[PDB]
Design a protein around this nucleic acid. Structure first.
Ligand SMILES: [Mg+2]
Ligand SMILES: [Mg+2]
Ligand SMILES: [Mg+2]
Ligand SMILES: [Mg+2]
Ligand SMILES: [Mg+2]
Ligand SMILES: [Mg+2]
Ligand SMILES: [Mg+2]
Ligand SMILES: [Mg+2]
Ligand SMILES: [Mg+2]
Ligand SMILES: [Mg+2]
Ligand SMILES: [Mg+2]
Ligand SMILES: [Mg+2]
Ligand SMILES: [Mg+2]
Ligand SMILES: [Mg+2]
Ligand SMILES: [Mg+2]
Ligand SMILES: [Mg+2]
Ligand SMILES: [Mg+2]
Ligand SMILES: [Mg+2]
Ligand SMILES: [Mg+2]
Ligand SMILES: [Mg+2]
Ligand SMILES: [Mg+2]
Ligand SMILES: [Mg+2]
Ligand SMILES: [Mg+2]
Ligand SMILES: [Mg+2]
Ligand SMILES: [Mg+2]
Lengths: 149, 77
RNA sequence: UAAGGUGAUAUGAACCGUUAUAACCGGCGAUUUCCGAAUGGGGAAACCCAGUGUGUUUCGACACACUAUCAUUAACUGAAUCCAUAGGUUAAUGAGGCGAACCGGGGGAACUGAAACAUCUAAGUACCCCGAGGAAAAGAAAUCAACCGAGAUUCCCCCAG
RNA sequence: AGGGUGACAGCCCCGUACACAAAAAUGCACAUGCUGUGAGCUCGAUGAGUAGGGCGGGACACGUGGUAUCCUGUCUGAAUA
RNA sequence: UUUUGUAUAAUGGGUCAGCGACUUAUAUUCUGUAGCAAGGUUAACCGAAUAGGGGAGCCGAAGGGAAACCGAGUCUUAACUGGGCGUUAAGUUGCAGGGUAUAGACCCGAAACCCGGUGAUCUAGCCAUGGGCAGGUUGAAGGUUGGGUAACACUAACUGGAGGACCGAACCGACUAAUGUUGAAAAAUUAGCGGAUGACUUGUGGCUGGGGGUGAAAGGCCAAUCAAACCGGGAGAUAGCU
RNA sequence: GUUUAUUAAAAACACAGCACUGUGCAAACACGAAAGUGGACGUAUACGGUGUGACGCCUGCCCGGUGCCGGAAGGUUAAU
RNA sequence: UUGAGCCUUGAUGGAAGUGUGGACGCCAGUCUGCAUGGCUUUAAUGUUUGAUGUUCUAACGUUGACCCGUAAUCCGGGUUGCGGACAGUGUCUGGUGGGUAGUUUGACUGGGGCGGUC
RNA sequence: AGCUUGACUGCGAGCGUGACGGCGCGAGCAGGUGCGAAAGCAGGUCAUAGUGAUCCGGUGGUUCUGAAUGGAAGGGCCAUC
């Protein structure tokens, strides 16, 4: 009585791992009450065709837009800027919709503040290349041109 | 009828044989148990009078298949 | 088929026949009370008592048919529990009991033999029990052989007391 | 051949050898029709709580023996040309 | 007939007639007999059917040794001066007979063991439902009233109607004797006898079944029988006995 | 009161009474391979087993043997 | 909780001063950690493997109560309560076991038994 | 009393005594041994009791056997329990 698992399950559980439990626990509780299944060999592939068509399939299906920054490897046209101030230095900040303004016509248009650098955002030269939230892994690269008027 | 619904197992006859080697007619008879099985395929407890082994069989072949027999054999369940 | 006939003890009576419906023989039909598996219920076999449908210039009542159980199927119904199962009625099919031996299986003695007796024997006999056929069962190698080969099963003669 | 006929019958009677016969119902053969039914080729697949094993019994001419082979009540349990 | 021995007062037989016990099958050996003879003979089956075919096989012509093996020899033992068993006599297949073996094995006969049935119409116990006990005695408790006590106690009449209570027919039993004992009767008759409102008695129907029932217990009773019923089967049990 | 129906009716059996011993109820015990059932529609003032056998006065010693009851050390000890 | 193995972080194989429990410590040491201050002898966990104990519930028991099939003291399904991996049963196994069963329980013998003998 | 292991191994003409199973006596042969200068004597004890068939099984030896073949198990043979 080996059986493979469905839900978690205390001292063995793991949503699909290969256990070997006492027959009773199974034909008396685990199965007929949905939680496991006889390891009927028919099954050890039926529930291994997933461990491959998933943990090696849908974990690769993620990789189709590398870095997401594809042909944007040469920065983007500077429509406007991101502001300035302090007669030479910097003074103004980025409203909850003001890092786009410059790169405001490139990719798809949005407007949200998934802030990444919890600092007072350094006030100097201008053009900088950090990262921003493009996804739970990758990054992106562009610059920032000010406006003289 | 001490008879295992899934394996056919009924009682058999034999001798006892002492040290003296004395034959005495006797019976071996199955370890039966009549257990309440869950089906899910039928949302119900079909409750067969099985012999362990009979049990071990269900535990392998599966109940829908064991109940598949019987149905196909005549038996009630 | 026919010139004789109506079985016997068993005559007699009243009759039927003789060239084709006397009788006799044979094929196929009809009729086939009651009891008996017996099956509408019951029951001390050959008896008692029903329900439902019918049916009568006298449509009271009394005659006629159908109503057992079980199994497979089907239709219609339908709980605890709302679906669903269970249950319920109805219908069509089938079974049921009897009977020689042979046959397959389930179970299985003892006297007796061993010059007592217990392993052993009698014996897988007698006997009970279930099932089937004209036969049954068995059967086309995970069989033998022996370094050559054979080629299912069944039965007979040998091998061999 | 056999039987009967007032005693022992080839030739008295019934028979016998032989040669023939059925409107009907059936048996078995074939030749056909009906309902089925599947045929042939290629490419596959090739019988697991099974084989084996411990325990207890039973079958094998074999009485557990040094005892292979088979069946299985109980507990277990493979390989896959 | 049995016996050391039977006229024996030991068995058996009333008498006649009919019946009534050493068989059959297959092996196996020996004798007789017949064929063929270092050979003899076929089985099943085939069949042109008592022929013929079939020589599968059996016995014999070669023994010794546990055997490997050797071989008119061989085994024994290192080997035997030797020793044991063998070489020197024909077989085989029918037929009849004499024995044996396996079968009921010359015929009849147990008490019994085992299997499967039939019996609680007799009887034991129990269940249901019904019936019966003439007549005559004794006179418990309780009650009433008197007398009694301080009041109870106590006490007398009467009332009452208990009891595996008394006597005694019916009914149920069965202690004694005689008769009977090829009976009137396979357990009685007669004269006496115990119980007789009770653990009583009886009708109808029911339940319990054989290593079982039931038993106020005798091993009693279970259909004229019971230390294990009756019928049928195993079964021609076995019988070193008569 | 019962008994050997058919050779024994008794001093035998039974008896009320006594004791011992089992049983907490799905009781013990009993029929029964089981199911079912009696015990009991009872429940320890009950139900079974055993012996004694109204009643009166009583019922002593013995636990080695046998039997039975209890014992969570050790010795010995089965399948496995 | 507990016997034993493996994996590990602490024992055998960013200095000096103002400060602490346990200890075979060669008999009189030094340590093993505790604060700070410009492959083999040792303790806890993760565990793997058996033993013991609590509890759980989900097999299994219910000769409690109820609902339905059902006008039903059977049965079955369902609900609920109590119990519970115990009890019970199958196989195997040691013990007890005249309750039952099959038998044995010699011969000689101045009858038999006893004695005696073989 | 001295030296010793003849309380040897294979055999055995020929006799006894038994229904039989068996038991007994035995010179002589071969090998090899002890004692004796030698002839020679020794196959237990003056003789006659001091015992237990067969089966099963154990132990040593021994290829005799050994189920396809080679081995092995088991069987035989001799020794002994
Ligand atoms: Mg009728
Ligand atoms: Mg009827
Ligand atoms: Mg006997
Ligand atoms: Mg005998
Ligand atoms: Mg057939
Ligand atoms: Mg295959
Ligand atoms: Mg005399
Ligand atoms: Mg004289
Ligand atoms: Mg005389
Ligand atoms: Mg009566
Ligand atoms: Mg009286
Ligand atoms: Mg009288
Ligand atoms: Mg009187
Ligand atoms: Mg007596
Ligand atoms: Mg009688
Ligand atoms: Mg009889
Ligand atoms: Mg017989
Ligand atoms: Mg006889
Ligand atoms: Mg009296
Ligand atoms: Mg009498
Ligand atoms: Mg008398
Ligand atoms: Mg009592
Ligand atoms: Mg007494
Ligand atoms: Mg006895
Ligand atoms: Mg004698």
């Amino acid at each position: 009585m080996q059986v493979i698992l469905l839900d978690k399950v205390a001292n063995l559980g793991s949503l699909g791992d290969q256990v070997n439990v006492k027959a009773g626990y199974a034909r008396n509780f685990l199965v007929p009450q949905g939680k496991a299944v006889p390891a009927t060999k028919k099954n050890i592939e039926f529930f291994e065709a997933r461990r491959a068509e998933l943990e090696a399939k849908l974990a690769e299906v993620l990789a189709a837009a590398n870095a997401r920054a594809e042909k944007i490897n040469a920065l983007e046209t500077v429509t406007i800027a991101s502001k300035a101030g302090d007669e030479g230095k910097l003074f103004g900040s980025i409203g909850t919709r003001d890092i786009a303004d410059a790169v405001t016509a490139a990719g798809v248009e949005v407007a949200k503040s998934e802030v990444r650098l919890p600092n007072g955002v350094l006030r100097t030269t201008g053009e900088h290349e950090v990262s921003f939230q493009v996804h739970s892994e990758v990054f992106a690269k562009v610059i920032v041109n000010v406006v003289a008027e | 009828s001490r008879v295992c619904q899934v394996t056919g197992k009924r009682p058999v006859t034999g001798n006892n044989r002492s040290h003296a080697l004395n034959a005495t007619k006797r019976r071996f008879l199955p370890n039966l148990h009549s257990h309440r099985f869950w089906v899910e395929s039928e949302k119900r407890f079909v409750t067969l009078r099985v012999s362990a082994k009979g049990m071990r069989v269900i535990d392998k072949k599966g109940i829908d298949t064991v109940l598949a027999e019987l149905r196909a054999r005549g038996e009630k369940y």
